[PDB]
């Protein structure tokens, strides 16, 4: 029958069709798909001039710029996608006297507050409110592009005016006093939002003015420098994690006559005793194990004799500049009794490891140790955070040592020191790096312990109502304690629209337009103000993910306390149960809402849309939370730190070649050689590292050669070689500061896109494994529709 085709169709087109059909048959594509593709091709080339060289040049780089379209994979409704993408592109764009000064301040402040009260309590019609919204939002946007602290204050005040307006409107004209069911839940949501507003106001106060304390130079004479004792308390950590801490301590740039390093062991392990004997540091193994780490430190204080005590965790390695950058203030302020240093984690956190964003997004704790403690510094409320700190022993002996009551002993002892009149200080430069939690369960547990301790301090010591303590200190401490009571409001927020969608209950009795015109400015201004203030500390919309991960596990213990090596990828079902339950509830709500959009009253058309967008936001948040709960592969014994240093390699025949170190770990290095000079996968190599102008040699064995990249494994080193290696790789006083300074800034829209992709990735992750089999089908359907829509944006 090929003769008929040859006669009817010109042979070039016939050959093209036959070849395309054969290619799609070999790839499994349907013959009907090939026929439809050819029909579209011919109808286009006759109804669309594809001969234009402009479109040919666009097609030349179309694959690189738009790799989401495949010419060899036809799909139903392809021309609709082409038209939609084309429409998106065409749419898209390609001094004075005291009394007079006080009176002037009084009049200015009262006038400004009267104007703010008028702005807050002015009823509007929707158009007037919208104009007000656009104007104030534009003012915020303009002030955003203005570096400094005055702009931060302006944004704080503007946000406070907007939030006070929102709360005033909610408390005046949203509570519907008609129903007994549309009242209790509405007031519950109102109380949740009032708590959130209070937390926001106290946080704005806390970081209103970071102090930016600077190190004070030490005296030139080395005989005036004070004696420092370093404590390293260990209970069950392996020696491989404390060795680097001890080696970095032995290399601290402090006079060895005035530096004693102690290893505290609550396990009575003989390996630690022998290690202490070999390296020359002290050792204490108490017979009675009471009060845990606080008791260990107290027993150590019973023997140590030094002016200052510096507490280090097992995994935290100090830089050599730590004592020189810290001790200056203790000799300047006689009242000082505590100094704090940031906590940095070179190990990838569970979020960073699982979600694949390690060096892109900032760490969870760099907002606290980067901005919050600096804010607490101004009000003299910088509390002990466990490690990377120095305490003067004379004040610490008066208070009876480290507090032993709560599980968070550091905050308690800092609170006692502040209540006895002593001050505290904070230094911003990261001078010690530790290991992050190895799993989501560990993060949940440590946060639970911290929250339990903070609630215990709130119930027992009660910073609000105690003894001599400044009001700013009270506010800072109560804000830190309230931060851990946010689980219940988060649960309310995640389960609020399900009320109306499931059981008709008007939580907010206002038209959807007015809700959009009042709630939205609050959120927009809060996001902008935080993005300016906590700029290189936390990306936008990420705090909700952490909050929702913690909420279900922090709310029960906090409430009770108020009353009284990944071999294979897997999903932590036990940890992820609450997220899956909330996803099921929200999606059954969205099914009911889809029903109500048609079979419900027509007047409730925008309200259902508002509830549905709320449910969609909830689902994105919970999907990100689930995405956290899948553990990525981890077979590296030691974690690697990406640092670029020039180096050199020495062979046994005496040839030296230059190389660039790209990453280092406890027992290896990774280097890059321009051309793969001379190295094989078992040869011994001497590695030359420079610390300033001094060069150090370390024996290595080659483990992997993959072209330019070479992996090296460290040979058994002596103690001095260990110290030198730590001083050349880990305890460098430039790695952590530049690490924190290299964090990208906060882009709210890009952050939203990343979080949406993360939620989609989490849904796809759960589309593979399923605890309750039934959920499998639903998850697969959701992922299917979601990627179909993504292909049709």
């Amino acid at each position: 029958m090929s003769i008929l085709t040859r006669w009817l169709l010109i042979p070039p087109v016939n050959a093209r069709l036959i070849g395309r059909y054969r290619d799609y048959r070999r790839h499994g594509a349907s013959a009907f798909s090939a026929t439809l593709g050819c029909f579209w091709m011919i109808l286009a080339w006759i109804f669309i001039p594809l001969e234009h060289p402009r479109w040919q040049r666009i097609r030349a780089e179309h694959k690189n710029l738009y790799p989401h379209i495949n010419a060899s994979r036809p799909r139903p409704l392809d021309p609709v996608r082409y038209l939609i993408q084309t429409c998106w592109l065409l749419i898209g764009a390609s001094h004075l006297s005291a009394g007079a000064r006080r009176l002037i301040l009084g009049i200015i402040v009262t006038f400004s507050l009267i104007l703010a009260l008028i702005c807050v309590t002015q009823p509007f019609n929707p158009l007037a409110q919208f104009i007000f919204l656009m104007l104030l939002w534009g003012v915020a946007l303009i002030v955003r592009r203005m570096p400094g602290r005055f702009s931060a204050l302006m944004l704080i005040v503007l946000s406070l005016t907007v939030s006070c307006r929102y709360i005033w409107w909610r408390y005046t004209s949203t509570l519907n006093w008609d129903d007994p069911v549309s009242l209790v839940c509405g007031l519950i949501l109102l109380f949740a939002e009032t708590y959130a507003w209070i937390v926001l106001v106290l946080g704005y106060f806390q970081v209103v003015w970071p102090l930016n304390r600077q190190p004070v130079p030490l005296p030139k004479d080395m005989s005036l420098w004070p004696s420092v004792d370093i404590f390293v308390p260990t209970y069950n950590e392996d020696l491989n994690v404390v060795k680097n801490t001890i080696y970095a301590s032995l290399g601290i740039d402090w006079p060895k006559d005035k530096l004693n390093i102690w290893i505290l062991d609550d396990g009575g392990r003989e390996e630690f005793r022998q290690f202490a004997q070999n390296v020359g540091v002290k050792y204490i193994a108490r017979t009675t194990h009471e009060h845990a780490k606080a008791g260990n430190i107290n027993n150590a204080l019973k023997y140590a004799k030094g002016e200052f005590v510096s507490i280090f965790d097992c995994d935290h390695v100090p830089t050599r500049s730590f004592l020189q950058m810290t001790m200056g203030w203790f000799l300047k302020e006689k009242q000082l009794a505590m100094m704090q240093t940031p906590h940095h984690f070179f190990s990838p956190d569970p979020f960073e490891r699982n979600l694949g964003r390690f060096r892109k997004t900032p760490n969870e704790g760099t907002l606290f140790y980067g901005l919050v403690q600096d804010g607490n510094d101004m009000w003299d409320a910088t509390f002990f955070c466990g490690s990377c700190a120095v305490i003067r022993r004379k004040p610490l002996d008066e208070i009876g040592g480290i507090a032993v009551e709560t599980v968070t002993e550091d905050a308690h002892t800092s609170l006692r020191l502040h209540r006895r009149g002593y001050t505290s200080a904070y230094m911003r430069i990261p001078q010690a790096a530790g290991l992050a939690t190895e799993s989501l369960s560990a993060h949940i547990g440590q946060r639970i312990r911290w929250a339990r301790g903070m609630v215990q301090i709130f119930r027992l010591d009660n910073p609000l109502t105690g003894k001599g303590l400044k009001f700013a200190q009270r506010l800072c401490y109560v804000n830190a304690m309230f931060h851990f009571l946010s689980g219940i409001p988060r649960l309310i927020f995640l389960t609020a629209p399900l009320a109306f969608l499931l059981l008709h209950a008007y939580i907010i009795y206002a038209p959807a337009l007015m809700i959009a015109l009042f709630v939205l400015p609050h959120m927009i201004h809060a996001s902008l103000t935080n993005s300016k203030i906590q700029g290189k500390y936390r990306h936008s919309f990420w705090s909700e993910i952490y909050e929702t991960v913690l909420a279900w596990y922090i709310a029960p213990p906090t409430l009770v306390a108020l009353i009284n090596l990944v071999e294979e990828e897997y999903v932590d079902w036990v940890i992820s149960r609450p997220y899956i339950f909330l996803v099921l509830l929200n999606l059954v709500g969205v099914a009911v809402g889809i029903w109500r959009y048609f079979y419900g009253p027509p007047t409730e058309m925008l309200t259902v849309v508002v509830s549905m967008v709320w449910v969609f936001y909830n689902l994105i948040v919970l999907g990100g939370a689930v995405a956290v709960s899948v553990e990525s592969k981890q077979v590296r014994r030691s974690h690697r730190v990406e640092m670029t240093m020039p180096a050199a390699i020495a062979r046994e025949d005496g040839h030296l070649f230059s190389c660039t170190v790209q990453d280092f770990s406890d027992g290896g290095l990774g280097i890059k050689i321009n051309g793969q000079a001379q190295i094989l996968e078992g040869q011994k190599v001497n590695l030359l590292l420079k610390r300033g102008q001094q060069e150090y040699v370390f024996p290595t064995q080659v483990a992997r050669v993959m072209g330019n990249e070479v992996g090296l494994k460290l040979m058994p080193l002596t103690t001095q070689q260990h110290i030198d290696f730590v001083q050349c790789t880990f305890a460098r006083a430039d790695t952590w500061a530049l690490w924190q300074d290299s964090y990208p800034e906060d882009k709210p829209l890009e952050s939203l896109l990343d979080i949406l992709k993360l939620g989609f990735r989490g849904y796809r992750h759960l589309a593979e494994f399923a605890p309750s089999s039934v959920k499998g089908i639903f998850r697969v359907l959701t992922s299917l529709v979601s990627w179909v829509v993504s292909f049709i944006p």
């Binding site: 234009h52 060289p53 402009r54 065409l90 749419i91 898209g92 764009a93 104009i131 656009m134």
Partner: protein, 144 residues
């Protein structure tokens, strides 16, 4: 040429057309869909050299100004030329009162917010396609 990559768009004239559309919606305009469409086609006419593009913009600026004046309900140039001497000879108080009555702050605010929205859109959503579509729709409605 092979590409004719000279359809750069209306660029700043999108705000001009948006102002005209808003004034027409307000009801203060004697709109001329044909003249607006011809002016838009003149603005979108592809030109090879950039110098010719700049010259075309410079020539179209007074043409657009005159078209905007014509499409309004303000009096024609004859009255202005006949009453310029009288306006010059009038007292300052009457001129100030006329200026105050001529300026509407609501109109100024609407124009400013429209300009800000146009800036935001031209940063994210191009406007030439929308302006052309609206002009074509108006022309079709008027002719039919």
């Amino acid at each position: 040429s092979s590409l004719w990559q000279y359809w750069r768009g209306l660029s700043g004239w999108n705000f001009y057309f948006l102002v005209k559309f808003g004034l027409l919606w307000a009801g203060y305009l004697n709109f001329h869909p044909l003249l607006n469409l011809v002016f838009a086609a003149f603005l979108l006419m592809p030109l090879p050299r950039y110098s010719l593009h700049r010259l075309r913009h410079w020539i179209a600026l007074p043409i657009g100004f005159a078209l905007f004046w014509h499409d309004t309900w303000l009096p024609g140039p004859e009255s202005i030329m006949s009453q310029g001497s009288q306006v010059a000879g009038f007292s300052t108080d009457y001129l100030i009162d006329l200026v105050t009555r001529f300026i509407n702050w609501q109109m100024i605010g609407a124009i400013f917010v429209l300009l800000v929205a146009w800036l935001f859109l031209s940063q994210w959503i191009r406007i030439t396609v929308f302006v052309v579509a609206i002009l074509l729709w108006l022309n079709v409605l008027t002719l039919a």
